[PDB]
Design a protein around this nucleic acid. Structure first.
Ligand SMILES: [Zn+2]
Lengths: 34, 27, 58, 112, 77
RNA sequence: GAACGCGCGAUACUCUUUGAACGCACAUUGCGCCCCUUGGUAUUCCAGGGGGCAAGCGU
RNA sequence: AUUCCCACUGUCCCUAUCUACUAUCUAGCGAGGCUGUCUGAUCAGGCAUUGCGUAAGCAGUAGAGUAGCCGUUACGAUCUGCUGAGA
RNA sequence: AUGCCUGAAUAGGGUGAAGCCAGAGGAAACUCUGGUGGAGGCUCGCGAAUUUGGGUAUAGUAGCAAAUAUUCAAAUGAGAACUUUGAAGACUGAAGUGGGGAAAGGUUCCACGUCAACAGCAGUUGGACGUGGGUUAGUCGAUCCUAAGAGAUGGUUUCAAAGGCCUGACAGGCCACCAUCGAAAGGGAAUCCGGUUAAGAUUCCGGAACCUGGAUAUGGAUUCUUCACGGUAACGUAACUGAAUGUGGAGACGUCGGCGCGAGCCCUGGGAGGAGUUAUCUUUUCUUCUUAACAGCUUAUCACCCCGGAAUUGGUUUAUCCGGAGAUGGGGUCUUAUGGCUGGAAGAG
């Protein structure tokens, strides 16, 4: 059970990192648009 | 095989790495 | 059927590969319980940022 | 089930010497050294393989005709078609913009 | 080696100044219909190549043999 | 002084390859250039032989 | 790492036997069955550091099953008899 | 201890990470189930360690020299356990006790004669002794080039007068930048098959073929007289001038995984031969049935071009990637890697 937990919080960290980098990419492309 | 033939003296004293002779000092 | 590369590696490189694996395992086991072996990221996390350091000094 | 080896001085598995096995008219398996394959010429702007140009070794080009290593279009044998089209369009638009800038400048110092 | 399908080209090859000998080779071989036949190869070497003419017709081979120069050496098989 | 050969050096009981060693390299009998000449179809090619190559914004 | 429970053991009571190797001298010199595998298959054998009591053959209408018809070809493990036989 | 340049090697078994597909629960986030996918400080056979070649930096006693299995007949010879032939038994078992190479060795290769010494018994044997024979290249290497680095010139291009070329019925002009060494595993123009000796082979012989350099001749083209055409296009061609100057490609470049294709080997059916076994059974067990470099015709995934304008979103890989920055669809262009037919070539084997 503890292993499955630590796995799901690892998934949480990975998804948050990917979402953050995607949002940053969109934000930095917005400036280059104009 | 640290030494080879020396042209000036004919001995097996020509150091291949140093390119110098330990018997007649060539060149 | 065994491949040629497998035969060559097992005839040539297996012994020293196994020995190095054993040595690495032994060293890791020995330094697992020692105190003072940390990664650079962990050292930075323990150190904290600048603002955390003025907070600690206060 | 007959074993063959190199036929030249190099005894090592280097890219220079590579071996194929063929059955000779004598009924035996023998080794044959294979040369390096040729590389298609590439466009000088985008790096894609040029179309309609023969793929040969560097010294084998001197023994074929010009139609086997060129294309009848301008820059043929050096640049592909899309790169040439882009060059033409860009040059024309640059010249037109130069004309427009010169006219605007002639207007703006025409005030004094 | 080169193959030629032209009879007059072969005759022109055999008519040059530097011609040594012509070889006539016979092969007993079967065709796709299954009936065996006689195939004749006329070989002459030019400057740097050996030109071969393959004829699967008996009468044409006989006519070409009769049309060869009388001062030309011919190897039978 | 050394190497290879028949005391001597292809003229071998004139002086090969070298060596302070000298066209350049060199643990290779490797790579050049210049002048004359000869031969093989020959103005072009190829080869052999001989002999060589360590000016000024000054007065 | 230590201590108790059960089971086993030549550790021991208490030694004994076999195989291999070794040691010695001489010539010269000289400080019946089973597993795996192979002989084309049976039969009969080889190898795997002993690898770990009913013969071969024939017959039966008895015989798991394979293979012919809607009383019936053939093959056939196993079993029974020749057979306390064979060696 | 830390390096640098150029090569070889970085294998296998197991497990199964992101991502993706189809389902179920939930308003999302998400969480389970099956598959797919094939990743790692995953496993298996301040410290230590971290494959490898070449180059290059900072008493007749101890004992028998230890690698198992030998036996029978014949030959030679003065002499045979040790030499030779045949038969039997046994061994290496493609990761060899089998065939080659770099380095290194230098005649140890082959033949004839011999056993004084040597091969720790013997020997008629020999990697021994004595005498001879043997190594053949335009295509294989070196030779050429540069790598790390080394090293002249006045420390490696530096307050150096450092060199070549061009024009013109001696003057003018152009350009910049340093020798050389350093790899028989890096880059590189080109040869294959068959046969042949006591000992030589991609080198010799026979046949067949390519590469580079050079001088030249002929045909054809260069179409009114002067450097050619076709297709919308990708592009095609028997040609189809091109100085200074400025560029581009090949050479020329990390490692791993699955998928597709070709070739060699392995497996296998029929048939044409030869060999073995057969008291009984066994259409049975073994072996031959091959096609070189080179050359002509033809043959492509990818990529690109033209038409066209797509949501009811389609196409599509084992791997979820692609499309108004133009998909699906229809029709074309190209590289010839690699197959097929043919010549070489059946005359060979
Ligand atoms: Zn391009």
């Amino acid at each position: 059970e503890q292993e499955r937990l630590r796995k799901i919080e690892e998934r949480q960290k990975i998804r948050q990192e990917r979402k953050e980098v995607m949002e940053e990419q969109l934000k930095t492309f917005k400036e280059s648009l104009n | 095989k640290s030494h080879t033939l020396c042209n000036r003296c004919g001995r097996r004293s020509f150091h291949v790495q140093k390119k110098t002779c330990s018997s007649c000092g060539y060149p | 059927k065994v491949s040629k590369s497998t035969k060559k590696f097992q005839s040539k490189h297996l012994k020293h590969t196994l020995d190095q694996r054993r040595k690495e395992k032994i060293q890791k086991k020995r330094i697992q319980g020692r105190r003072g072996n940390k990664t650079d990221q962990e050292k930075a996390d323990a150190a904290g940022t600048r603002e955390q350091q003025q907070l600690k000094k206060s | 089930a007959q074993r063959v080896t190199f036929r030249r001085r190099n005894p090592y598995n280097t890219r220079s010497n590579k071996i194929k096995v063929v059955k000779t008219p004598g009924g035996i398996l023998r080794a044959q050294h294979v040369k390096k394959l040729a590389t298609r010429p590439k466009c000088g702007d985008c790096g894609s393989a040029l179309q309609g140009i023969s793929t040969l070794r560097p010294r084998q080009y001197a023994t074929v005709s010009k139609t086997h290593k060129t294309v009848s279009r301008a820059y043929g044998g050096s640049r592909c078609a899309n790169c040439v089209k882009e060059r033409i369009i860009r040059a024309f638009l640059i010249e037109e913009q130069k004309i427009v800038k010169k006219v605007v400048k002639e207007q703006t110092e025409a005030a004094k | 080696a080169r193959e030629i399908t032209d009879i007059k080209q072969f005759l022109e090859l055999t008519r040059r100044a530097d011609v040594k000998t012509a070889t006539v080779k016979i092969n007993k071989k079967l065709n796709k219909a299954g009936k065996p036949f006689r195939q004749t190869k006329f070989k002459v070497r030019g400057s740097s190549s050996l030109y071969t003419l393959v004829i699967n017709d008996a009468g044409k081979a006989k006519k070409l043999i009769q049309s060869l120069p009388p001062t030309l050496k011919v190897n039978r098989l």
